[model samples]
Target: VIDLGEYGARFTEDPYPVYAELRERGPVHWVRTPPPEAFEGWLVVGHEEARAALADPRLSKDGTKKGLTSLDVELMGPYLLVVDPPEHTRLRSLVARAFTMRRVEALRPRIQEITDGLLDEMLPRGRADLVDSFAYPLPITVICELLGVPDIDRVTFRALSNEIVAPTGGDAELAAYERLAAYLDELIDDKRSTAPADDLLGDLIRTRAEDDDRLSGEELRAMAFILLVAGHETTVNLITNGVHTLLTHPDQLAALRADMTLLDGAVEEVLRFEGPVETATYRYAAESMEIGGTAIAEGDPVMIGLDAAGRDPARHPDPHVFDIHRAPQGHLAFGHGIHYCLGAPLARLEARVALRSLLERCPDLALDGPPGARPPGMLIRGVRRLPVRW
Candidate 1:
């Protein structure tokens, strides 16, 4: 077993080395992560293994159906994830209809407005925490406006979201879920009671599935939960981490600066280099299966190493090196298979607009201090406070 404590390491701070070590040992191995106290799982660190494992139906995603998890299914709602096949198919279709690319594409001017507005607040200051001043707010605003989620006061919501992402361990995590659930209920109720707005959440509130099926109350809560946190949390990292990566690699920065056409590739490379997600949400074996020559019994928690897969030398010639102009396919930053990230386009849009504009606005943008507000836990990763001056 890999003991993080013994090595004084965390998957959040510097996981690449440990992941590399694991990869060197084998394609798959029993390993513990986040903390030694946490349960160990079959970690697939090989790109080839990860690619198949992600699409394998034998490895189920429905924790409830298989009794692998103890989540309050009724309270959590069956969002796009945590369910399999037909249920997931239905959820994806409905949400996809509402969260259309045209819908996201249409928000270009508004996103620009928001980006400009945030920078307006930041540029005047000589130096500021980029996370607080820009990164956090951009995607948060976009997701909120896109989904029409209620005005969640940022300070309280951040704390609640942080707890869910990392968890201090006991009643607090439950309480945060309860509070967010209750708030989402209130928001949805208000939407259902009133006339529909031009927002996605409002549309979702009114949307009906085929055969008159509707999102149940619990499902709505789950949907909101996923959208609010899953929606913006990683995007926040995308921006914060993107800024950090580009700034650190002056040569890469100069290359991108030299040609705006390379902006899209730079974003893709950023994802490959240091993607927001450390690993995909947990998956479980539904039946006895073998991966990378190891037998995995039924009901075992399995982790497919997205970060590790991206850095696997077997897939990329120089996995450790960060290259902005690197070919932009096969990276599992958004994941693979049907459960691939739904909010990817929006995340990319925000980053594309956000980064292009930020660089344009502050030609001399530079990181201020050691990155700050980095959470202790590995579940949710990224520097909370990125101080920058331009």
Candidate 2:
């Protein structure tokens, strides 16, 4: 078994080498994830294997349905995830209708405005934690405004959201979920008492009120929670990680600075090079299956290593090297199959705008010092604080 404790902080600080070591041996191996997630599971580290495993129906995403996960599904409610088939199909259909590309595209101007506003505030500082100053605020503001949550206490929300995604152990994760769930309930109640605004959450609330069959009350709260947490948390790191990767690789940065047209490719490379997500949550085997000659028994938890797959030499030549111009198509950064990230269009837009605007405004942006601490555990791959200066 590949125990993370054996590697100490190296596994968390920089996992590429460890993943490489495992990939050399085989495609899938039993891994003991770090604390808070000290459970043992199979991790797919090979590109070819991981890609197929992601879409493999035998490898189910509904852990709660199988009674295999310890997550308090009732307390957390049934979000888009943790459910399969008809339930997931229904949830995705409803959310997808409201979260159309047209809706996301319409927000392009506003996204740029938010990006500019954050940069305007940070540019004068010369040096600041990009995570706190720019990366975190831009997406958070966009999501809040989209959801019609105008006056959320961001400081508290950030902490709660972080805990829910990357728990530090103890009862903190459960506690965070409880508070956020309650918060969403109150927010929905407020929206109900007053006329719902013209927003995604408002639309969802209206749909539920109009017909209980369309969407349940708990489902409404769960939808808002997922949108609030998943919407911004991943995007926050996308911006931060993009900046960090570009700054660290000066050659790539120079190339991008030379031509703004390379911005899109650069963002795609960033997703492949140092994407925000480490693994795509957790998936359990619904039946016996074989992946890359490895037999996986039913009910075994599986974690697909998105970070590892990007750097698989079999797929990309010199996978370890960071190339902004490389065609990173088919990358699993946003995942694949039916569960592909719903907010992908918005994420791409944000990254493109954020990187282009940041580089354009701060011509000499560079790492201020050593990159700050990364969030513990393998769920999210990003620095908590990125010290940067122009």
Candidate 3:
């Protein structure tokens, strides 16, 4: 049995080593915890197994299923990310038009403007915290503006968004979710009373009312909450982590800085090399199923180790090596198949611009201290205060 106690300690620091061992042992391993009372779940560490399990129909995304009892469904509500088919289909379809690649591409100029503006403030100073000053705010401000969140409330809302995404438990998580939900409900209700100009939320109201297929008020609130929260949270980490990795790996950083054409692949490599989400949101089994030679009884919770999958040698030879020029293949960093991230294009745009702008302004950037001096977290990994000097 793999000792989870020691593994947990390693996970807190860097989980890749333990994941490598687990892959060598088997594609799937039973993590022995403190019996059925504490926490128990199958850990999927291999690339093929993670992809298969993610696409498997037996693995349900809906948290209401048998194995997902650990999740507080009421607190999470009926968001599309947590539900299965028909509902997932309907909800996803409604928002699909707004998240199209064409629309995202059209926002490129605006994304660059935002990036440049943020860099303008950070540049004169030879040192700055990328996360606090730029990475976190760029996406937050853009999404808030898209959703019609007033500028006065952006700071307060951004704080709440950060708290919700952090891996805090108990009343803190619940309270954050409820407060956000209540705020969205009020925002949607006000939009209904006095419609605003063309925006995603406004478009949603029009689609539901005119097309007769719009999301309900509660649904609207849930979607708004999810899109705003998910859109900003993960992207912030992507930019921060991407910059951190590039700075640490100076060879790759110098190469990309020399050739702007390599920025796309560089970003992809960063996602695969050291992604933000260590695991995909929890998935549970809908019925009895066998995955990677392990029989999962109905309702058993399965956590997909996305970070581990990207580094699996079976899928990508020399998986540990960072190669920006490698042809972009399957990377679970944004998930796979139908459940792939909707805001992927926008996130890519933001990261590409953010990283490029930072390098352009501060080509000689270096970490202020050892990597261990940075903050720690499981779900999203990045420096709490990335003190850097040019």
Candidate 4:
């Protein structure tokens, strides 16, 4: 059911090859026992199957609702990923009120401010590990500043956030991190305050309509957690990976430099070629269902390999090659259907600003060493230390 050997630094660096092998054998399979999953759930490695499964009602995002208990958040904190219709619809609508294009675009000044300052400090060094000095900070600062988080403690915040995402920690360990999250949570001010609330967290805290729809404490906590995770972690890798790819392929970098117009397509290409997320968020079969020529029984954990699906030759011909000019069509990077990433727009903006500014600032930017070691997790795909020199 599982490759005990695949859980290592080597596998994380390039698991796509194994995903390719799995895909060739068959698109889907029960990677565990026949009945109730002891080994977890069904694994989908095909592009078309993954795309269909993402939108399929037979698979429930709220695994518990479908009689599966893979996830445990004591706080009733079912945000976007762990909920179904009606609840998902309502939560999205409430949050949507704050993320209007006008509000998001208005963040341009702050994003630019953070981007420039981060580069200003890093570029003069002439040689440094780019991810820590620049890529990590740019998005992390933008999201914090936007959320009105004051005096950001980069280390503590990252530790707390990383525990939640990078490892999928134990409930006790996860609960322990809440104290730090609470520091940021306190900034939200659930109680009405005299100061004009400007940040997204404040907006969420203040959101009330006839007292029927305000977020519960658990829900609020989960929402903030996801916002931070999506905003900071995903953008860091996208920028890091994008720049890494460009430097490795000077021809593509030249193509982008010659016409900045290619920047948009370049970003899309980066997403397809090596997105931050390696797979879609977890799901479970609500009822017995069949996919990729295999039967998926109820209560089985269903994992769709976003990375594998993106590289499916059936969907994208010559899928292994990285081409900035290839037409962006059906790749499942941001995901598909109802649970697609909410922070995608913000992510795109941050990547563009971070990648463009760094390229402009360091025309000589190139890898300082073999790409730094990768973290150990199937949940993400990115470098730990992106060594670079201008």
| Candidate 1 lDDT by residue in tens digits, 295-341 | 99998888888878889999887987778888568888888999988
lDDT of each: 0.81, 0.85, 0.76, 0.76
**Candidate of highest TM-score:** 2
C-alpha TM-scores of all predictions:
0.95, 0.97, 0.92, 0.91
For model 3, how big is the CA root-mean-square deviation? 2.7
lDDT of 3 at 70: 30
Which pairs clash inside model 4?
A: 41-301
Identify the runs in model 1 with alpha carbons over 4 angstroms from their true place. 68-74, 208-214
lDDT of prediction 1: 0.81
Q: Please, what are the lDDT tens digits per residue for candidate 2 over residues 1-390?
A: 878768888888889999999999999999898876787999999988999998888877777767555453677567777777778898888878656677788998999998889888888889999988889888888888889987888989999998988888668988888888888888888888886588888888888878998789878888888888888889989988899888888998898888878888888888898888889876889999999999999999899999899999999789888998895886889888888888888888887888888888988889999888888878788988999898
Clashes of 1: 0
| 1 against 2, candidate with superior TM-score | 2
Between prediction 1 and prediction 3, which has the larger TM-score?
A: 1
Segments of candidate 2 deviating more than 4 angstroms: 69-72
| Runs off by more than 4 Å, candidate 4 | 2-8, 32-39, 66-72, 100-102, 168-172, 190-194, 209-214
The clash numbers for all candidates, in the given order, read 0, 0, 2, 1
